[PDB]
Write a protein that binds this DNA or RNA. Structure first.
Lengths: 88, 116, 65, 271, 101, 65
RNA sequence: AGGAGGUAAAAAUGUGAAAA
RNA sequence: GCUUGAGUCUCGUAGAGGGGGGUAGAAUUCCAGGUGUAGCGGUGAAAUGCGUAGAGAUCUGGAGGAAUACCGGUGGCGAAGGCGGCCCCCUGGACGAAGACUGACGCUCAGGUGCGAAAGCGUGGGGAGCAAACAGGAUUAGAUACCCUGGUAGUCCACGCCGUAAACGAUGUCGACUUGGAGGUUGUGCCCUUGAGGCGUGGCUUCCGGAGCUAACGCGUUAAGUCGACCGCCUGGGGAGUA
């Protein structure tokens, strides 16, 4: 889900304004939260098959976006992976 | 006998037989009705005529019982279904109520598969 | 389900069932689902209903009458 | 739980353990523990009356409170103790006036679930009360037969008794044999099933394990000599005699119910 | 919070002991910040099907916008007491009043 | 074939007793949209109010009690 | 005429080679 | 670097989307009384089965497990398999009017990976009904056959496992492009909300059919029409999808 507030929270925490949500770095960070937003749901119920299908779909959007910013910028990539703690 | 006014005749109408013992809402059961015990075997078991002659032989000597009008509770299709109790009304013995309780479930337990 | 009328009935007089089912839901939904085929038998008679619909539109040609 | 060990040696291969970590790994409560010598199946005459008995590890008798006449005072479950004499684990309870008792452990019992016995306690697993005060259709264990006897039926691990009908002063019970028996409504019963229900899955594995449980080897009938048992003798395996006990009584088919005074209380036969 | 429609109903014998407990559940409704909209004591009308006993039971309606924590509380509260005939909770829809029926 | 939400806005709820019983029948059947001409999205809401009031005992699960 | 109800016993074989 | 590609947020739309937990009534129905006459039963007809202790039948009382009649529809959602009473819980994805935002991050994909009807299988429960294996009566030139009365495993929930199908709209996925009629259809723009609407908008879907195309059948704006990206697959039939 990643409710409206927490989405509107991190954009104002990783970006210039709340309109920076369709900007790349926050586009990444909302999905990183999206994994953690669903980590509890897979800690339970063990059979939500279609629910995990959305998560695997997401991690590609994380990774495919992880290389576009990496492509245009080596340092913003190194910053984003340590501004949040991803890419291992 | 017991000499009462009316009664509650529950008819279990199977695909073969309109089984009805002259019963009551309290369990007082006296006068049987059978589509095989009234003769009529062979093709005549699921025939409406088997039930009608059995239903007149169901209300046999019930005038002495005091009972004239009887609450028919017919359950199922029944071989006669529209003449078994009707000839009893045509003979004169009217019905207080015909409650055709079709036991319709919400499709619970699995039903059989005869006539493969 | 109930056909009584209570004062003026004196006979069965049950066309309520003859106009609704009379044996309909008892002799069909008693058993045997199969869960696979009927929809085609539904649709083929619905195609017959479509054919009943199609034949009603092609009535007016000349017909010699 | 139910664990199977790796085949590191034959005799270790088919073993399945019944490990239960909740059990009190300590020493049992001293004053509730009396001695108990073994017998080897020998009566006052010293003769072996029941065979296949002897040896085994030395065990002590834990005083299991069966009667539960302590009523009105609540009891806190202290700890779940393993028991050698029973088949089910027992529980050490703590009566609120300061008493220690050992009771059978019901199914869903934890270390600290407060229980109560008598007519006052509501329907809860581990509570005990006369059967006229129990809703018919329930499931009990530790059932008395005479009022004040102590409780004889449904004592084994993983058993239970369903109360099926209550006729006045008598109660019909679904006994774990596919059988129904009448009993006085004033008799007490403990609610719920008896815990340690996985005991049935225990596999002894090797021959020595049954030996240290006190069971001494049996001997087949045909392997004996025709003066010690009605079978046997001959060229070996040449049978032809109907299966009989060593004392001439036929086995495999003969009903031996010979009581005559309690058939009034038995409603339905064993299945 | 959720804009739920709590309702229930009650058999006549219980109908005169639930009013003491009506204050108890209205201690729960208002005690969890839940904004009450209806409190409808409709009256003992005849039931559609015989519910645990004969027909003709009293009905009491709530329709309260309350948080989910108390909706968990109330359903669990009737688990130990099947006296008050079961409470059904309906979805949001965001409204307040339709007076009597 | 009636006044619907485009013109006749109406809450399809199980609280309103009138409209709830207007699409039922004595034979234990919600009247289908094939004759009454209701709209489908509201028919699903029309479907829901029956199951809702069946729990409220405004309508039973059978008809004989 | 749109919907509906209503509908019927077991019955087998005839191996080769013949297309202006 | 912008932007019609693509992507994100906002705000409303609907739904058997997934799973977990309660619930309720009916229904074949077992534990029995009441009261009660001889059959019940089944079909092509007969019969083994079955009941005189009193069955079928009878109503009140008690126990469940497993599925949800009408609604329900070439209807919805999901990749597909497939999923259907109700109710709240954590949670999937799509669509829509109109804005702001980064500015080509995409399209497909060997390998690998996951899901994957039923049946079968593994441990444990669970068992009401249905019913393989299994019993019988007959119809029969044969009955391991229809028809017929019993019944186990299975169905069952939880965890595993198998990884097969006519797993099929027998049509791969992605995007552009090319006359229409007539149904179903949900967000949605304007006008008189004057009134059952008029006038559209688009998602998706059903059927008949145009050019074209097709061996023909037919498909036919959801193409099998007109092109492009790329993966997979076939080379006569049997042998064999076997060794």
């Amino acid at each position: 889900s990643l409710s409206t507030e927490a989405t509107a929270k991190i954009v104002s925490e990783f970006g210039r304004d709340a309109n920076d949500t369709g900007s790349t770095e926050v586009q990444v960070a909302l999905l990183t939260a999206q994994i953690n937003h669903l980590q509890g749901h897979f800690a339970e119920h063990k059979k939500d098959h279609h629910s995990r299908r959305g998560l695997l779909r997401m991690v590609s959007q994380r990774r495919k976006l992880l290389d576009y910013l990496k492509r245009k910028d080596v340092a913003r990539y190194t910053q984003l992976i340590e501004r949040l703690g991803l890419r291992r | 006998r017991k000499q009462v006014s009316d009664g509650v005749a529950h008819i279990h109408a199977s695909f073969n037989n309109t089984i009805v013992t002259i019963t009551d809402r309290q369990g007082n059961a006296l006068g049987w009705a059978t589509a095989g015990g009234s003769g009529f075997r062979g093709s005549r078991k699921s025939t409406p005529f088997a039930a009608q002659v059995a239903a007149e032989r169901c209300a046999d000597a019930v005038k002495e019982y005091g009972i004239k009008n009887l609450e028919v509770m017919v359950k199922g299709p029944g071989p006669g279904r529209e003449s078994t109790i009707r000839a009893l009304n045509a003979a004169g013995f009217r019905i207080t109520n015909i409650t055709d309780v079709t036991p319709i479930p919400h499709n619970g337990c699995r039903p059989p598969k005869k006539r493969r | 389900i109930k056909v009584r009328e209570n004062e003026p009935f004196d006979v069965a007089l049950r066309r309520f069932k003859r106009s609704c089912e009379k044996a309909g839901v008892l002799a069909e939904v008693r058993r045997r689902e199969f869960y696979e085929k009927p929809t085609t038998e539904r649709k083929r008679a619905k195609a017959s209903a479509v054919k009943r619909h199609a034949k009603k539109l092609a009535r007016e040609n000349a017909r010699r009458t | 739980a139910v664990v199977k060990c790796k085949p590191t040696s034959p005799g270790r291969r088919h073993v399945v353990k019944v490990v239960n970590p909740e059990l009190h790994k300590g020493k049992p409560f001293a004053p509730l523990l009396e001695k108990n010598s073994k017998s080897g199946g020998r009566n006052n005459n010293g003769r072996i009356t029941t065979r296949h008995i002897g040896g085994g590890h030395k065990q002590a008798y834990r005083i299991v409170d069966f009667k539960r006449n302590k009523d009105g005072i609540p009891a806190v479950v202290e700890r779940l103790e393993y028991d050698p004499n029973r088949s089910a684990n027992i529980a050490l309870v703590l009566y609120k006036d300061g008493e220690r008792r050992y009771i059978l452990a019901p199914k869903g019992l934890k270390a600290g679930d407060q229980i109560q016995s008598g007519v006052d306690a509501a329907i809860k697993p581990g509570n005990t009360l006369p059967m006229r005060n129990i809703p018919v259709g329930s499931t009990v264990h530790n059932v008395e037969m005479k009022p004040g006897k102590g409780g004889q039926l449904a004592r084994s691990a993983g058993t239970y008794v369903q109360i099926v009908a209550r006729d006045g002063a008598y109660v019909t019970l679904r006994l774990r044999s596919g059988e129904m028996r009448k009993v006085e409504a004033d008799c007490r019963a403990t609610l719920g099933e008896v815990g340690n229900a996985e005991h049935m899955l225990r596999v002894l594995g090797k021959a020595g394990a049954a030996r240290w449980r006190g069971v001494r080897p049996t001997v087949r009938g045909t392997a004996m000599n025709p003066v010690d048992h009605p079978h046997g003798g001959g060229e070996g395996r040449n049978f032809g005699k109907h299966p009989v006990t060593p004392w001439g009584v036929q086995t495999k088919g003969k009903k031996t119910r010979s009581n005559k005074r309690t058939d009034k209380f038995i409603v339905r036969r064993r299945s | 919070m959720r804009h739920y429609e709590i309702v229930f109903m009650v058999h006549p014998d219980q109908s005169e002991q639930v009013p003491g407990m009506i204050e108890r559940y209205t201690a729960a409704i208002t005690g969890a910040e839940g904004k009450i909209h209806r409190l409808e004591d409709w009256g003992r009308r005849q039931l559609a099907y015989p519910i645990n006993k004969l027909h003709k039971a009293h009905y009491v309606l709530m329709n309260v916008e309350a948080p989910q924590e108390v909706i968990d509380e109330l359903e669990t509260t009737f688990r130990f007491n099947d006296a008050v005939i079961r409470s059904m909770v309906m979805r949001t829809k965001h409204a307040v009043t339709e007076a009597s029926p | 074939f009636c006044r619907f939400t485009a013109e006749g806005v109406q809450e399809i709820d199980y609280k309103d007793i009138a409209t709830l019983k207007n699409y039922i029948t004595e034979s234990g059947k919600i009247v289908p949209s094939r004759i009454t001409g209701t709209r489908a999205k509201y028919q699903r809401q029309l479907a829901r109010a029956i199951k809702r009031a069946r729990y409220l005992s405004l309508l039973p699960y059978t008809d004989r009690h």
